[PDB]
Amino acid sequence: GKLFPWAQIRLPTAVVPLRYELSLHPNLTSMTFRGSVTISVQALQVTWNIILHSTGHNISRVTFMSSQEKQAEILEYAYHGQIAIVAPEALLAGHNYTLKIEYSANISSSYYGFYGFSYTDESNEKKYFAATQFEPLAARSAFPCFDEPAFKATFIIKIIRDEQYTALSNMPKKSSVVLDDGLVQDEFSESVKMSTYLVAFIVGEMKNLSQDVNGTLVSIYAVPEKIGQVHYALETTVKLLEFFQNYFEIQYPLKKLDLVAIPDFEAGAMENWGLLTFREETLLYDSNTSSMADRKLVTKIIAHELAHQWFGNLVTMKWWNDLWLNEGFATFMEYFSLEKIFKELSSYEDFLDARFKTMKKDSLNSSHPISSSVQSSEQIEEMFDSLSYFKGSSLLLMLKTYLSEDVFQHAVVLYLHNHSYASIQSDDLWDSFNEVTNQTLDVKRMMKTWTLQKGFPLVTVQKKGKELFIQQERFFLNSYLWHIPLSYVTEGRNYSKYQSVSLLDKKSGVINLTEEVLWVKVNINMNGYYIVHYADDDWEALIHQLKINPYVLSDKDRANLINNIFELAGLGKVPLKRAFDLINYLGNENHTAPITEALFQTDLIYNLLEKLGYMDLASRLVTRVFKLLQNQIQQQTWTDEGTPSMRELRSALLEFACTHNLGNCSTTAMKLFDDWMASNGTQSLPTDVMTTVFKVGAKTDKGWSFLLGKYISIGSEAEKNKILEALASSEDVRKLYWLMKSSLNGDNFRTQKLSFIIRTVGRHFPGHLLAWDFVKENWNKLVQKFPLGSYTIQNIVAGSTYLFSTKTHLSEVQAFFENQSEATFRLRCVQEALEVIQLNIQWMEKNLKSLTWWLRT
Ligand SMILES: *[C@@H]1O[C@H](CO)[C@@H](O[C@@H]2O[C@H](CO)[C@@H](O[C@@H]3O[C@H](CO[C@H]4O[C@H](CO[C@H]5O[C@H](CO)[C@@H](O)[C@H](O)[C@@H]5O)[C@@H](O)[C@H](O[C@H]5O[C@H](CO)[C@@H](O)[C@H](O)[C@@H]5O)[C@@H]4O)[C@@H](O)[C@H](O)[C@@H]3O)[C@H](O)[C@H]2NC(C)=O)[C@H](O)[C@H]1NC(C)=O
Ligand SMILES: *[C@@H]1O[C@H](CO)[C@@H](O[C@@H]2O[C@H](CO)[C@@H](O[C@@H]3O[C@H](CO[C@H]4O[C@H](CO)[C@@H](O)[C@H](O)[C@@H]4O)[C@@H](O)[C@H](O[C@H]4O[C@H](CO)[C@@H](O)[C@H](O)[C@@H]4O)[C@@H]3O)[C@H](O)[C@H]2NC(C)=O)[C@H](O)[C@H]1NC(C)=O
Ligand SMILES: *[C@@H]1O[C@H](CO)[C@@H](O[C@@H]2O[C@H](CO)[C@@H](O[C@@H]3O[C@H](CO[C@H]4O[C@H](CO[C@H]5O[C@H](CO)[C@@H](O)[C@H](O)[C@@H]5O)[C@@H](O)[C@H](O)[C@@H]4O)[C@@H](O)[C@H](O)[C@@H]3O)[C@H](O)[C@H]2NC(C)=O)[C@H](O)[C@H]1NC(C)=O
Ligand SMILES: *[C@@H]1O[C@H](CO)[C@@H](O[C@@H]2O[C@H](CO)[C@@H](O[C@@H]3O[C@H](CO)[C@@H](O)[C@H](O)[C@@H]3O)[C@H](O)[C@H]2NC(C)=O)[C@H](O)[C@H]1NC(C)=O
Ligand SMILES: *[C@@H]1O[C@H](CO)[C@@H](O[C@@H]2O[C@H](CO)[C@@H](O)[C@H](O)[C@H]2NC(C)=O)[C@H](O)[C@H]1NC(C)=O
Ligand SMILES: *[C@@H]1O[C@H](CO)[C@@H](O[C@@H]2O[C@H](CO)[C@@H](O)[C@H](O)[C@H]2NC(C)=O)[C@H](O)[C@H]1NC(C)=O
Ligand SMILES: *[C@@H]1O[C@H](CO)[C@@H](O[C@@H]2O[C@H](CO)[C@@H](O)[C@H](O)[C@H]2NC(C)=O)[C@H](O)[C@H]1NC(C)=O
Ligand SMILES: *[C@@H]1O[C@H](CO)[C@@H](O[C@@H]2O[C@H](CO)[C@@H](O)[C@H](O)[C@H]2NC(C)=O)[C@H](O)[C@H]1NC(C)=O
Ligand SMILES: *[C@@H]1O[C@H](CO)[C@@H](O[C@@H]2O[C@H](CO)[C@@H](O)[C@H](O)[C@H]2NC(C)=O)[C@H](O)[C@H]1NC(C)=O
Ligand SMILES: *[C@@H]1O[C@H](CO)[C@@H](O[C@@H]2O[C@H](CO)[C@@H](O)[C@H](O)[C@H]2NC(C)=O)[C@H](O)[C@H]1NC(C)=O
Ligand SMILES: O=S(=O)(Nc1cccc(-c2nnn[nH]2)c1)c1cc(Br)c(Cl)s1
Ligand SMILES: *[C@@H]1O[C@H](CO)[C@@H](O)[C@H](O)[C@H]1NC(C)=O
Ligand SMILES: *[C@@H]1O[C@H](CO)[C@@H](O)[C@H](O)[C@H]1NC(C)=O
Ligand SMILES: *[C@@H]1O[C@H](CO)[C@@H](O)[C@H](O)[C@H]1NC(C)=O
Ligand SMILES: [Zn+2]
């Protein structure tokens, strides 16, 4: 880079793009493409060079176009992904110029950038498909551009395809001219002002189902064989689109909106303006073969991706340090829209579980402020983590419960209007709230520690007569104050309940209770991003109540108490026995949210013990939890009867009983599976129990082979994923290895399912070591397919490491990562992984001998 005219990661500010015209001629059979982009730019400062982004481009020609065309010289700096155009005459300030670069390139074999893949039809024909995934930083691999989100421009896109293939892009199509040799050239209309990471184009054989919605054509695309499965998606997109245009008070601005089920896609979906793109398993749906977890997944993702058309596309963060302004808003709007127009799905259970898991991570010293400087490519990819998504929506949810829902909307609508087709940073949002409260509250001041400081506060609560003493401190095990909007509910001696709110912006304070009260619970429904720790008498009060009658608290409040007690046991604020004391109430619980959280704490302790060789202790622990839930597990029916939350409770209890061979569930499941196999896979299996039935079946070599045959045979991808979870839960190490190797190479299983497979293998005893070895031995190939730092990698590092609980393993994991580049060693997921092992070591030090005692007999 020493003879390159630019020394920094971030492009200069002296030249800005106005309009791109991109012409691509891709070849899916040779996996290459020819390109010619033409950029109109304006120079704001006198410069001799244009610094631009480009990787993997064999550039044949560069010309400064006018009348007279001037050839220009081009320099490359691949370490920074940058190229430098040397101008023949200096670019003057206040002038604009038009640049043209003709180039050729390979189509990607990764999931990043303009990538191409191959699939097999039902008629057993091989088919070719090409698609884009640019966010965060791959647009530059497709065409030269100013590949930073603040450089918003307009795009005209042109594709030369073979006539059998459809070409979609962000904007509607304008023209189609038929050329020689079976080729068409599709031209698309010029786009709105957008960032380069949103540009998208697809080439593949696809059918469509469309509906006009008030002048905007809404279409669902999929390969021809799956087109019968897009109806639900179409219905749901219409509902959410009219809900969002109403709540935001800004119409969706493009004449069409496409949603595309891509046969091979790593993310769950991508929010490209006008061309939303999804995994097949996250868009297609069939009530006959898809569980209610599947339904809810399709509807969540749609809600999330549609919300990005306003939060992210219309209004974009200036730089990736504020990614949470896109992803936090989209995740809030996803779960908010679901509670207003799809209450029945009880999506709040999903949002609550996700916040519980984000908080465990956010509690580690390897956590970062949700707004953190990032400059390196891997630092940018790592910004796509749970904090951006679920601590960002928790910040919004804390504000929405604090201020009115009406105040919140006012601020949202004002924010989006002011900043349409432009860029924003954190303070711009805190301003819009300040304007809506007519500057009474200083939102910018209150939101400071939540935005700039990692972690969350521990609120400690003690009752003294008719008052509550409240304090706050940082939640950590070896820092500024937070402005904490506190909520409490309390039951009086006349058995009357009251709730109120108070804002703790100092270290300590006293809440005046107007009466004397039986118990008190702070942080209603965990609408605040903090953990609450009670004095001993005040835990006991809440525990005594849960045994007498748990239903004076909501089911979110009860899930919150189980999560907080166990997380406070890890910290050491309460002995582990008090956690177990609390979930002894579970005999009277029959709601999903609390049972789900108890089973997770239970299963996490089981999976830890099992790896350490304490197979006896683990099993004692599940049999004690089984007795607590015995009545609930035995009521369960093997059907799809009931509300969504009851169907989800059914799957959790039958999965927990079958997995630990408790009761006769094993036997019921084997009988149902064996009758399924006799039918040759044609008998009705209830969707709710299909994971569980398959898993039991996959434990024999006959049933394993049978399941595999239908995996490569059936048309329901959601059913295929239940088969894959059952296949990957075999105890036959040869088969597990064969499953990972196969997904990694793209044969039979697609590389998109690898993270799922690796994690399933690594969760149980047979594959535990196997999965971590596959990760270590295939690290370099993994990082060819998935970018270093991205969520797929974070998910693989975490899922293969987090059940290690020995000093030896700690040093192994650390030393393996030190043998990689510093960029790899200093990845946040790698550091978080090392801290989680260290906490396992200490948790076992503190709690093992006493756990052996309460399970003695
Ligand atoms: C990327 O590089 C490619 C390599 O140079 C380039 O060339 C294209 O390559 C692909 C892949 O090989 C070809 O697609 C395949 O085409 C064949 C043959 O298609 C022709 O024949 C069929 C039917 O006749 C066949 O029938 C029997 C069995 O039925 C065969 O045994 C027999 O030998 C015959 O091949 C016919 O239906 C096709 O007609 C199509 O196109 C015409 C106009 O071109 C239309 O009138 C018609 O409606 C129809 O759409 C065709 O004449 C086929 O068997 C495969 O299934 C597959 O379709 C391309 O044909 C080939 N193109 C050319 C011009 O050579 C790619 O073009 C290049 N891509 C880009 C974007 O540049
Ligand atoms: C999760 O768990 C909670 C707690 O167990 C459930 O709530 C309970 O639901 C049961 C339903 O079986 C309730 O029991 C019902 O009692 C009703 C009337 O109670 C009055 O009368 C009894 C004596 O009969 C007194 O003890 C009491 O003080 C009341 O004054 C009955 O009407 C019900 O029987 C009905 O069904 C049968 C057969 O269908 C009919 O033949 C009858 O005519 C009658 O209509 C039933 O016995 C219990 O009271 C509830 N308790 C609480 C605390 O809520 C939730 O339902 C459960 N949730 C889920 C999703 O499973
Ligand atoms: C069960 O027993 C309880 C006993 O507390 C009964 O509830 C109380 O009922 C009495 C009589 O009706 C109420 O007394 C009245 O209170 C009026 C004030 O109402 C508003 O303020 C209350 C408290 O305000 C102070 O405290 C809070 C918390 O620190 C601060 O934020 C405020 O700024 C104040 O300093 C709220 O509880 C209430 O909902 C209103 O917001 C007052 O104007 C009247 O003149 C009278 O004094 C008493 O407020 C009730 N207490 C509570 C906690 O609700 C209940 O009725 C009994 N059960 C049955 C069935 O009757
Ligand atoms: C450099 O290139 C820019 C970009 O094209 C030129 O600026 C452009 O100027 C025209 C007007 O001369 C703008 O069009 C206007 O649009 C508004 C509303 O959309 C309309 O009311 C006007 O009647 C007019 O049509 C245009 O928006 C503006 N920029 C862009 C990005 O479109 C500029 O003139 C060129 N030359 C120089 C010396 O800078
Ligand atoms: C697939 O999409 C096309 C549009 O791209 C649909 O055919 C169009 O129908 C719309 C209204 O639904 C009209 O605005 C267009 O003029 C039609 N175009 C053509 C070329 O006929 C078609 O209906 C969609 N397929 C399904 C099954 O809905
Ligand atoms: C259906 O489309 C029309 C036209 O796009 C919408 O009317 C627009 O509403 C916005 C918001 O107030 C105005 O800024 C435009 O000027 C209106 N356009 C026209 C032509 O009147 C209409 O709101 C849409 N339907 C719904 C339910 O929102
Ligand atoms: C927690 O992590 C922080 C940073 O992630 C560590 O703080 C650094 O400590 C070194 C000590 O040599 C300093 O050079 C750095 O400046 C510190 N970073 C910051 C941001 O101040 C700290 O060591 C860790 N703490 C614990 C208890 O593990
Ligand atoms: C629109 O957004 C602009 C930012 O472009 C807001 O301007 C900020 O306003 C606050 C409070 O007045 C100031 O402290 C900032 O310094 C301003 N920023 C800039 C860059 O000027 C403006 O408040 C918003 N307008 C409306 C009508 O809401
Ligand atoms: C805490 O709340 C209690 C109950 O509302 C307050 O006690 C009341 O105080 C008012 C105002 O002085 C008196 O008129 C009543 O006689 C009291 N009621 C009862 C039932 O005792 C107390 O003043 C509050 N303290 C603070 C610091 O706000
Ligand atoms: C059970 O289902 C399987 C599909 O997994 C069937 O296997 C197919 O059978 C037909 C002919 O019967 C062949 O044309 C296909 O190629 C087979 N698919 C394969 C082997 O992957 C099987 O036939 C079904 N059982 C019965 C009794 O019909
Ligand atoms: O691949 S995703 O699984 N797809 C996806 C996209 C949007 C929202 C959700 C969601 N909603 N509720 N829970 N998750 C999931 C994922 C990527 C990153 Br970065 C995450 Cl954080 S999640
Ligand atoms: C670059 O493109 C030129 C012109 O098409 C071609 O001759 C040359 O082989 C290409 N080089 C590489 C390394 O792709
Ligand atoms: C395309 O791939 C081949 C094989 O890896 C490589 O030699 C060539 O340089 C690639 N093209 C570009 C433009 O990098
Ligand atoms: C299992 O035992 C329960 C009683 O706990 C009984 O109702 C059920 O029928 C039994 N299941 C089978 C398959 O025998
Ligand atoms: Zn998103």
Ligand number nearest to the C-alpha of 430: 8
Is the distance from the beta carbon of residue 227 to the nearest atom of ligand 5 less than 6 Å?
no
Probe residue for ligand 2, chosen from 552, 555, 590 as the CB with the greatest number of ligand atoms within 8 Å: 590
Please give the distance, rounded to the nearest whole angstrom, from the Cα atom of residue 378 to the centre of ligand 15: 18
What would the two tokens of residue 2 be? 């020493």
Is the distance from the beta carbon of residue 98 to the nearest atom of ligand 4 less than 6 Å?
no
Answer yes or no: is 652 within a domain.
Answer: no
Answer yes or no: is 240 within a domain.
Answer: no
Atom of ligand 4 nearest to the CA of 154: 31
Cα separation, 396 vs 329, in Å, equals: 7
Answer yes or no: is 597 within a domain.
Answer: no
Amino acid at 560: N
Cα separation, 334 vs 305, in Å, equals: 8
- Does residue 194 share a domain with residue 54? yes
Q: Kindly report the protein residue whose alpha carbon is nearest to atom 8 of ligand 10.
A: 713
Probe residue for ligand 8, chosen from 423, 428, 431, 442 as the CB with the greatest number of ligand atoms within 8 Å: 431
- Does residue 171 share a domain with residue 66? yes
What's the length of the chain? 857
- Does residue 174 share a domain with residue 37? yes
User: How far from 823 is each of 23, 380, 730, 793, 819, CA to CA, in Å?
Assistant: 35, 12, 36, 14, 11
Probe residue for ligand 5, chosen from 210, 238, 255 as the CB with the greatest number of ligand atoms within 8 Å: 210
- What interhelical angle do 555-571 and 576-583 show, nearest 10? 160
Please give the distance, rounded to the nearest whole angstrom, from the Cα atom of residue 365 to the centre of ligand 7: 9
- Does residue 373 share a domain with residue 323? yes
- Does residue 837 share a domain with residue 717? no
Helices (H) and strands (E) in the chain — how many of each? Answer: 32, 29
Amino acid at 651: S
- Does residue 794 share a domain with residue 697? no
Cα separation, 778 vs 471, in Å, equals: 49
- Does residue 466 share a domain with residue 568? yes
Cα separation, 632 vs 602, in Å, equals: 16
Show binding-site residues for Zn(2+): 304, 308, 327
Is the distance from the beta carbon of residue 508 to the nearest atom of ligand 6 less than 6 Å?
no
Q: Tell me 14's DSSP state.
A: S
Q: Where are the beta strands (DSSP E) in 28-138?
A: 32-43, 47-53, 58-65, 70-71, 73-77, 82-91, 95-106, 113-120, 126-133
Q: Which range marks the domain in which residue 43 is found?
A: 1-204
Exposure on the CB side of residue 581, measured as CA atoms within 13 A = 15
- Does residue 833 share a domain with residue 786? yes
Give the CATH number for residue 386. Answer: 1.10.390.10
- Does the active-site annotation cover 305? yes
Please give the distance, rounded to the nearest whole angstrom, from the Cα atom of residue 75 to the centre of ligand 1: 40
Q: Kindly report the protein residue whose alpha carbon is nearest to atom 8 of ligand 12.
A: 58
Please give the distance, rounded to the nearest whole angstrom, from the Cα atom of residue 98 to the centre of ligand 4: 15
Nearest to 789 by CA among 493, 319, 393, 378: 378
Q: Which of 21, 305, 378, 610 is catalytic?
A: 305
Answer yes or no: is 596 within a domain.
Answer: no
Is the distance from CB of 740 to CB of 310 less than 8 angstroms? Answer: no
Domain count, the chain: 5
Give the CATH number for residue 163. Answer: 2.60.40.1730
Atom of ligand 4 nearest to the CA of 18: 31
Is the distance from the beta carbon of residue 96 to the nearest atom of ligand 4 less than 6 Å?
yes
Is the distance from the beta carbon of residue 30 to the nearest atom of ligand 1 less than 6 Å?
yes
Answer yes or no: is 288 within a domain.
Answer: no
Is the distance from the beta carbon of residue 166 to the nearest atom of ligand 2 less than 6 Å?
no
Residue 114 pairs with which residues in a beta bridge?
Answer: 132
User: Contacts by 343-347 with C-beta closer than 8 Å and gap 24+?
Assistant: 344/643, 344/644, 345/292, 345/295, 345/296, 345/299, 345/644, 346/592, 346/643, 346/644, 346/645, 346/648, 347/296, 347/299, 347/300
Resolution of the coordinates, Å: 2.6
Is the distance from the beta carbon of residue 127 to the nearest atom of ligand 11 less than 6 Å?
no
Q: What is the largest CA-CA distance in the chain?
A: 92
| Residue finishing a domain among 727, 751, 777 | 727
| Residue finishing a domain among 419, 452, 485 | 452
Please give the distance, rounded to the nearest whole angstrom, from the Cα atom of residue 436 to the centre of ligand 6: 25
Answer yes or no: is 308 within a domain.
Answer: no
- Exposed (0-12), middle (13-18) or buried (19+): which is 590, by Cβ within 10 Å? middle
Cα separation, 122 vs 779, in Å, equals: 34
Show binding-site residues: 135, 268-272, 304, 308, 327
Show binding-site residues for substrate: 135, 268-272
Is the distance from the beta carbon of residue 590 to the nearest atom of ligand 2 less than 6 Å?
yes
| Residue finishing a domain among 204, 225, 252 | 204
User: How far from 138 is each of 133, 210, 261, 466, 823, CA to CA, in Å?
Assistant: 7, 30, 21, 60, 19
- Does residue 470 share a domain with residue 368? no
Count Cβ neighbours within 10 Å for each residue of 744-755 and write b for 16 or more, e otherwise: bebeebbbbbbb
Answer yes or no: is 637 within a domain.
Answer: no
Answer yes or no: is 606 within a domain.
Answer: no
Residues 6+ apart with CB under 8 A from 773: none
- Does residue 139 share a domain with residue 22? yes
- Does residue 161 share a domain with residue 72? yes
- Does residue 477 share a domain with residue 506? yes
